[PDB]
Design a protein around this ligand. Structure first.
Ligand SMILES: Nc1ncnc2c1ncn2[C@@H]1O[C@H](COP(=O)(O)OP(=O)(O)OP(=O)(O)O)[C@@H](O)[C@H]1O
Ligand SMILES: [Mg+2]
Lengths: 147, 231, 269, 144, 220, 59, 115, 115
């Protein structure tokens, strides 16, 4: 349950599903995903939040709202901010996924949020073009789908 | 950064953030690195992040930054505008049309925006007053086309009352600055946020409907409009 | 294929938008001209209504057929904002009541779109006129009106109604139908006779309400066109906005491809 | 959320029975509104059938609006969906649809707290709950 | 006038250096207390010659195959065009010239391809200069011979570069052309226009016809 | 005529019977058509309803 | 899609359906700025048949009743040809467009039009 | 193309032809969407002359007879200026635009129009 009548009635999410939150900037994409994590403070689903290429102040605000709403004790926060190395931003989603998999392999349920999968693709493109690897469509590497 | 450590709140003005991006593109080409989308440097987001992440509010002081922004080929989806907008908290637009009207500050109240314009940050009162001013100014811009195409006699009594409040609001957005005394021929004014909210809230509610619009031009706080009208 | 074709199409749509913007103002001016021509005919209608009233009261012995128990108006030009359809949709509803009862229906068509609606559906007609100036004159309507007056006197028609849009407001054009046929202490001196006068005045009154109807429908045509051209200008902007996004996508894609080719050749040479 | 292009490939099988049954009439109402929303300003003179669809469309849209940091429970969401589908907002004004909802939920948290806890358990829907809800709503309509 | 030439058959190095040679000849008069004017007939051809030398030296390429320092090429040239104070002229002349401020004014020329001002070299030079005079093919084919699009052309120096008489009579000319650009679709409906607007429309059309001039006919 | 007021309901053209009849016959002349029909033609409502919906989409 | 493989009747029905949709695609820009009311009498008739053909090409699948809830439909080649031939001839010019959407066979469109 | 080199009459005729063709290029889109009746009386006349000038620029060539079947023509500069000056002035506003297509001098357009 995300706690939103529009999503929980017309666009339901099941345990083990991958549901994409897509849209332009400043429309509530983070708002919707953070409220979905806050709603799991009583369900029994442990949550993980991966911040990729975000501002440090934005990351700090989200952590405060999670503790103010009583949801931080169930959440794991993985942060790779906008000034950190492209290698760390490209690897943060796999580190957070590994922490979430700890619960799935032992018979438990978990929820993972990737704050900007488009910022992970920009970080991986930088590393690829600095290793002189031929580029494709929109200058992204040939294995961007596989990332 | 030094002044912030001293215990101060500091203003950092950057003459043009697009030229910072271009200088990075030029250096990246000179060093022989493989270019990215639209010909920018592969390090575009990291070079912007290294600069923009130092500008923050710490536990000692706070560096606030005003940055002029240029948009290539009028395209807001171009990598440079796209990357910069990701680190902006507010957008101030200066309008050539507003300047002709005579409002020298020239900030466009409809196109300019801020991420802080949220009731969960500035409280319900400031938010409702600001959104009230923007609603009345929007309706007046629509009514002005009606008055031009069909005439002022075609409008309802309620719409003509709105036009009168909108005009008073539009002039009350003006202010004499201490650095502009040479141009305005009048002394400068520093209005507080409390005085700003109270003045616009009163004009929206109609507490000043009897005063002439000119009394609300280049005055500062709302008590100064009352007196400028008395004479 | 590329950015050149999209650039030509954005210029093509921008040219049409400026003339549709001008035509909305041109229509507003003409709407104001048709609204004063509406008010310059009320005196002849309100006073004759009074005269025909008293003349009948003081002469009860004569009861003209008009006082005891369709003319359709359409445009000659395009760009109308469904002015014709909405009335033609009320003409069909009213005709149904009589076609179901079994009564026959004669029709009189004023304007081009009325003729089009009947040639397209094989409809019958008894009188017709078009090409009337944006400034009509009552004399042109006399011929078409007379064919309906003679019909009503000869029993060829049991009731006559005028179908026209009414200028409710600059934004509203109410389609309506009203019955043309059938319709103190002192007494007037009558020259030559009361019957002769009643017969003449009733004809002046029906020809007058038909002219009132045509002129009001022209004011409705101008207002409807003002709205049609505003809509067209707005729609053009939306297409320009969508094309500009496709153009920016093509612009950025052209730059990346060229750089790949330059880098690719330099990585060989 | 744009209900026209937003979709869940495996979600249908995941909904609880109460939300799965009541949600049937939401997406369709938003679709009927999708075809009339822009034209609604001049639809007050159109066929009564179109007006019924439009009245419902403007209500359902308003109800879907919600606030940040305020999550609803399976029960609270169910109450709202029942009034919207079954028919309890036709009288409520669009500007009141939200208030009617806040009041209706504050009411059932005092007048039928047991029924809420029973719906929050597994979110199962039966004739008892279906009747229990119409009884509670019809009572609320007269009382508050 | 001094005429400096580097024709199409001459070495790309000479075409690359010619603007700097001409600038150096113009700087003599500025540094000694006098005034000069310089015209670079095609900065886009200087950029093309510098690109040839760079790709043949195997320097890393960028957008449109230009080298990484093509902005610095034109900027290093155009920032020399300037006005210097009396103290600079007295320092350079070692006291000989006093009380006089020298200057070098530049009129660089650039060719656009089908009106594309977003190209790499045009974008660089538009950002370096104090203003731009845009000439248009549609205006030139419509008989508007000088072809200056006054709606987008701008001088950041503005009224400070005008004599008192031209500064007083140019203000209304600006308003009349602006009104004409807004009311140009109504010419086919001049009869249906409102009188005030019809008065403005003919004024706009008469001021627009006044701007047309002939070649080799400069006015005082 | 009344003691207080005098109204003149003036005509704009000669109402002679030949002129009167001529313009009526011109209306009949133009009214004539190749497919007059029986006079009971109907059910065209579907076309007018189809266009009405398109006209809603236009605005 | 060759007369020597499928027969002339199916090939003509397919050619006719495509001809109708192609013209409708060409009038799109004019209708976008001025609306359907400015088209010629014949053009308006085609735009009406093109819209019906388009929704009659829609079909509920048996692997999609989980997504939608409506039951799936299997339509034979004979029923397919008969339905499109009728819409091209004008045999269905009196039904509303929404009577052709997700109706499988043409008879279901006739029974859908009753509501 | 300078008055000092070719004379003022030739130069004015060339600029006159270019002005009419540039104005027709911007009226083409108007005529496509709205139609030709929504133009001013001056614009309707200008569009007719632009279409005549555009066809009077075509010419049958001696080296192209195998491609056209029509005999070639050589027009002198005096004849060219006269033919375009006449069309701009209005001396041929009665002849149809098809009379000016593939002819030579302006007299052959006058003969072609009759047939
Ligand atoms: N339900 C809501 N009620 C009120 N405000 C909301 C609601 N949902 C989101 N917002 C507001 O929307 C704004 C943007 O939200 P958010 O920062 O989460 O969007 P985002 O897409 O993640 O933006 P970004 O691209 O910067 O990460 C915030 O001011 C937030 O408070
Ligand atoms: Mg976010």
């Amino acid at each position: 349950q995300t706690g939103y009548k529009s999503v929980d009635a017309m666009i339901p999410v099941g345990r083990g599903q991958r549901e994409l939150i897509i849209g332009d900037r400043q429309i509530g994409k983070t708002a919707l995903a953070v409220d979905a994590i806050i709603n799991q403070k009583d369900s029994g689903i442990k949550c993980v939040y991966v911040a990729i290429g975000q501002k440090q102040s934005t990351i700090a605000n989200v952590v405060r709202k999670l503790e103010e709403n009583g949801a931080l004790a169930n959440t794991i926060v993985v942060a790779a901010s906008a000034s950190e190395s492209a290698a760390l931003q490209y690897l943060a989603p796999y580190s957070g996924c590994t922490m979430g998999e700890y619960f799935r392999d032992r018979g438990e349920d978990a929820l993972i949020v990737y704050d900007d999968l488009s910022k992970q693709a920009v970080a991986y493109r930088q590393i690829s073009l600095l290793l002189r690897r031929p580029p494709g469509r929109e200058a992204y590497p040939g294995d961007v789908f596989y990332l | 950064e030094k002044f912030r450590d001293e215990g101060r709140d500091v203003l950092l003005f950057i003459d043009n953030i697009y030229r910072y991006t271009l200088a990075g593109t030029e250096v990246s080409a000179l060093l022989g690195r493989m270019p990215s989308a639209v010909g920018y440097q592969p390090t575009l987001a990291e070079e912007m992040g290294v600069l923009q992440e130092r500008i923050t509010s710490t536990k000692k002081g706070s560096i606030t930054s005003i940055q002029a922004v240029y948009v290539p080929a009028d395209d807001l989806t171009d990598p440079s505008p796209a990357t910069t907008f990701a680190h902006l908290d507010a957008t101030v637009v200066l309008s050539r049309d507003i300047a002709s009207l005579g409002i020298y500050p020239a900030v466009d109240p409809l196109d300019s925006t801020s991420r802080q314009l949220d009731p969960l940050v500035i409280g319900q009162d400031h938010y409702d007053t600001a959104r009230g001013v923007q609603y009345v100014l929007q309706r007046y811009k629509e009514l002005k086309d009606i008055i031009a195409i069909l005439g002022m006699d075609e409008l309802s009594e309620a719409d003509k009352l709105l036009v009168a409040r909108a005009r008073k609001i539009q002039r009350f957005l003006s202010q004499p600055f201490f650095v502009a005394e040479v141009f305005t021929g009048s002394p400068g004014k520093y209005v507080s946020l409390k005085d700003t909210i109270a003045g616009f809230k009163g004009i929206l509610n109609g507490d000043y409907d009897h005063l002439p619009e000119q009394a609300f031009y280049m005055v500062g706080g709302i008590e100064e409009a009352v007196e400028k009208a008395k004479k | 294929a590329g950015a050149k074709e999209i650039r030509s199409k954005i210029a093509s749509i921008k040219s049409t938008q400026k003339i549709t913007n001008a035509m909305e103002k041109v229509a507003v001016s003409k709407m104001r001209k048709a609204q004063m021509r509406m008010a310059a005919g009320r005196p002849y209608a309100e006073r004759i209504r009074q005269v025909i009233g008293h003349l009948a009261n003081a002469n009860p012995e004569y009861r003209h057929p008009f006082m005891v128990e369709y003319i359709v108006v359409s445009s000659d030009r395009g760009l109308c904002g469904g002015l014709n359809i909405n009335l033609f949709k009320s003409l069909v509803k009213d005709m149904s009541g009589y076609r179901e009862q079994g009564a026959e229906i004669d029709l009189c068509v004023i304007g081009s779109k009325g003729a089009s609606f009947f040639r397209s559906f094989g409809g019958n007609v008894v009188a017709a006129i078009s090409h009337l100036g944006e400034e009509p004159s009552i004399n042109d309507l006399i011929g078409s009106v007379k064919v309906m007056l003679d019909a009503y006197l000869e029993g060829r028609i049991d009731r006559l109604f005028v179908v026209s849009n009414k200028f409710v407001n600059t934004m509203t054009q109410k389609p309506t139908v009203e019955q043309l046929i059938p319709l103190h202490h002192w007494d007037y001196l009558y020259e030559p006779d009361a019957k002769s006068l009643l017969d003449g005045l009733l004809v002046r009154y029906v020809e007058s309400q038909v002219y009132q109807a045509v002129v009001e429908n022209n004011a409705c045509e101008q207002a409807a066109r003002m709205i049609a051209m505003k809509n067209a200008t707005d729609n053009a902007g939306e297409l320009i906005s969508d094309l500009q996004l496709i153009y920016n996508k093509a612009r950025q894609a052209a730059i990346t491809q060229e750089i790949s080719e330059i880098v690719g050749g330099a990585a060989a040479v | 959320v744009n209900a026209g292009i937003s979709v869940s490939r495996v979600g249908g099988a995941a909904q609880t029975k109460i939300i799965k049954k009541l949600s049937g009439g939401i997406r369709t109402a938003l679709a009927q509104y999708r075809e009339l929303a822009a034209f609604a300003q001049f639809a007050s003179d159109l066929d009564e059938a179109t007006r019924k669809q439009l009245e419902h469309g403007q209500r359902v849209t308003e109800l879907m609006k919600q606030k940040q940091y305020a999550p609803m429970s399976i029960a609270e969401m169910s109450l709202s969906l029942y009034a919207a589908e079954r028919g309890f907002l036709q009288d409520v004004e669009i500007a009141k649809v939200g208030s009617f909802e806040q009041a209706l939920i504050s009411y059932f948290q005092r007048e039928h707290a047991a029924l809420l806890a029973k719906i929050n358990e597994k979110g199962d829907f039966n004739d008892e709950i279906d009747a229990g809800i119409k009884a509670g709503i019809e009572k609320f309509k007269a009382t508050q | 006038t001094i005429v400096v030439a580097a024709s199409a058959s001459e070495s790309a190095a000479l075409q690359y250096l010619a603007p700097y040679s001409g600038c150096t000849m113009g700087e003599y008069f500025r540094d000694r207390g006098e005034d000069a004017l310089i015209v670079y007939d095609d900065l886009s051809k200087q950029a093309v010659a510098y690109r040839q030398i760079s790709l043949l030296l195997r320097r890393p390429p960028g957008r449109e195959a230009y080298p990484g320092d093509v902005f610095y090429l034109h900027s290093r040239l155009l920032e020399r065009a300037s006005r210097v104070s009396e103290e600079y002229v007295e320092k350079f002349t070692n006291g000989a010239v006093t009380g006089k401020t020298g200057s070098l004014t530049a009129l660089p020329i650039i060719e656009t391809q089908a009106g594309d001002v977003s190209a790499f070299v045009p974008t660089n030079v538009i950002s370096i200069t104090d203003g731009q005079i845009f000439l248009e093919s549609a205006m030139f084919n419509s008989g508007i011979r000088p072809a200056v699009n006054a709606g987008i052309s701008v001088s950041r120096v503005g009224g400070a570069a005008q004599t008192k008489i031209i500064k007083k009579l140019s203000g209304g000319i600006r308003t009349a052309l602006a009104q004409y650009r807004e009311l140009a679709a109504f010419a086919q409906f001049a009869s249906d226009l409102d009188e005030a607007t019809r008065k403005q429309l003919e004024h706009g059309q008469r001021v627009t016809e006044l701007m047309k001039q002939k070649q080799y006919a400069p006015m005082s | 005529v009344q003691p207080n007021m005098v109204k003149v309901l003036a005509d704009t053209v000669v109402r002679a019977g030949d002129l009167d009849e001529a313009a009526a016959q011109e209306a009949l002349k133009a009214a004539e058509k190749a497919l007059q029909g029986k006079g009971a033609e109907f059910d065209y409502s579907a076309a007018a309803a189809r266009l009405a919906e398109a006209a809603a989409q236009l605005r």
